[PDB]
């Protein structure tokens, strides 16, 4: 329809304020075309013209389905903007009007209502919880209450998954516990669907739900999703691997029993690839995940050893992006803090000393503290074998003693005390 292309806001207002439903329809279509242009769509000019209450009333026009669709699309693009722009849509009374449109017999209208509510919920915790209080979850889940997800239109299913992921998103506060329990069986079902975009957004939803206290993690782990998350951890698509690794990383911040479920599902077999992944963010999050597994029980540290992951940790400590190296330093300090003497001895035999010492040259106070604590734990294990001199020589040979010597004359209190202590105790 070339007749509704490049209208001015003034003309859109004239059409919408006419007492003619057809003129209102043409002007609403003209508004959605303005609001869907790639170059700076005039969202604030449409808001200032007072058009949001008119679009919201058009949502209720059951007799005119095209004006319901055009106004839903126009409002979706306004709600997609800034928090102030989403607020203007919510202030117009759009939330219950969009929820009423979820049960529409027109699939393209229903989908637009799903999209709009995803944008509103996606703004933050308060609008997410307001969408929930207006009762969006029951009609949203009803749209997915089919025997096989493959019968639904692809774009439609992707929009439903994405909107459900925004209802799972954000913290302070986290989503209501009862809302999470209501959504989780549909989420577990979407996590087994064959579409890469549905899988990515399902993983993102699971990653938000596992980002919190152990009670929140427990809700997810009890649904038996960990084996599916580990399978997706092995996917070829980076948009699937990224949220799958984030969810797994979040679960291992939980209890040692919750971490054990990740190990039992076969997650450690994927870490040789994840710890050498060419995408730095995958390497960083894989090493962060490793740090929270090495912070566990001695039998869990043993499974890290058995899977041949200690040479991979030496590798990341030797060469990686600094942020990944900082996570590796944490993984080593956690391993040395909770491991057996035999496990700590193994770490030295894998060559941890030289890369650990080279990272003392870093201009980061926290990594220096983490490495010095790891050295203390390594010496503590060497004290139990009477091999402190053998370790002292190894540290001296790679130029590690010269780096600890300079750390005695360091600005930070913790660095000064730990380095001075190591030299007067072992050098």
């Amino acid at each position: 329809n070339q007749g509704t292309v490049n209208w001015s806001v003034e003309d859109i207002v004239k059409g919408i304020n006419s007492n003619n439903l057809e003129s209102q329809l043409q002007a609403t279509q003209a508004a959605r075309k303005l609001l869907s242009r790639e170059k700076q769509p005039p969202i604030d000019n449409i808001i200032r013209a007072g058009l949001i209450p008119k679009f919201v009333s058009f949502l209720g026009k059951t007799d005119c389905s095209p004006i319901q669709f055009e106004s839903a699309w126009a409002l979706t693009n306004i709600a997609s903007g800034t928090s102030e722009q989403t607020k203007a849509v919510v202030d117009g009374g759009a939330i219950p009007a969009f929820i009423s449109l979820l049960a529409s017999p027109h699939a393209h209208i229903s989908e637009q209502a799903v999209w709009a509510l995803g944008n509103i919920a996606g703004d933050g915790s308060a609008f997410r919880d307001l969408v929930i209080k207006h009762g969006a979850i029951d009609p949203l889940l009803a749209l997915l209450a089919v025997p096989d997800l493959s019968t639904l239109a692809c774009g439609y299913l992707r929009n439903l998954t994405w909107t459900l992921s925004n209802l799972c998103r954000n913290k302070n506060p986290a989503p209501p516990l009862d809302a999470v329990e209501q959504i989780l069986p549909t989420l577990v079902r979407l996590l087994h669907h064959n579409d890469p975009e549905v899988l990515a957004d399902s993983c993102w939803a699971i990653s938000y739900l596992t980002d919190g206290p152990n009670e929140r993690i427990e809700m997810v782990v009890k649904k038996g999703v960990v084996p599916q998350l580990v399978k997706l951890l092995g996917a070829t698509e980076l948009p699937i691997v990224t949220p799958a690794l984030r969810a797994i990383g979040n679960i291992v911040t939980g209890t040692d029993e919750q971490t054990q479920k990740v190990i039992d599902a076969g997650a450690l077999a994927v870490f040789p690839s994840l710890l050498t992944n060419p995408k730095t963010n995958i390497q960083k999050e894989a090493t962060w995940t490793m740090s929270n597994i090495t912070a566990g029980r001695q039998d869990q540290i043993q499974q890290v050893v058995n899977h041949g992951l200690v040479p991979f940790l030496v590798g990341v400590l030797s060469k990686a992006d600094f942020k990944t190296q900082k996570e590796a330093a944490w993984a080593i300090t956690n391993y040395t803090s909770g491991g057996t003497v035999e496990q700590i001895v193994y770490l030295v035999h894998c060559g941890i000393i030289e890369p650990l010492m080279n990272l003392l040259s870093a201009k980061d106070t926290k990594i220096i503290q983490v490495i010095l604590d790891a050295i203390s734990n390594i010496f503590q294990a060497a004290e139990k074998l009477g091999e402190t001199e053998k370790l002292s020589i190894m540290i001296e040979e790679c130029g590690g003693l010269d780096k600890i010597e300079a750390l005695q004359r360091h600005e930070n209190e913790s660095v000064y005390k730990a380095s001075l202590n190591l030299i007067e105790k072992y050098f």
Binding site: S36, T76, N77, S80, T86, G118, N119, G122, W204
Partner: peptide, 6 residues
Amino acid sequence: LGKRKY
């Protein structure tokens, strides 16, 4: 990934 326009 937050909000999306159509």
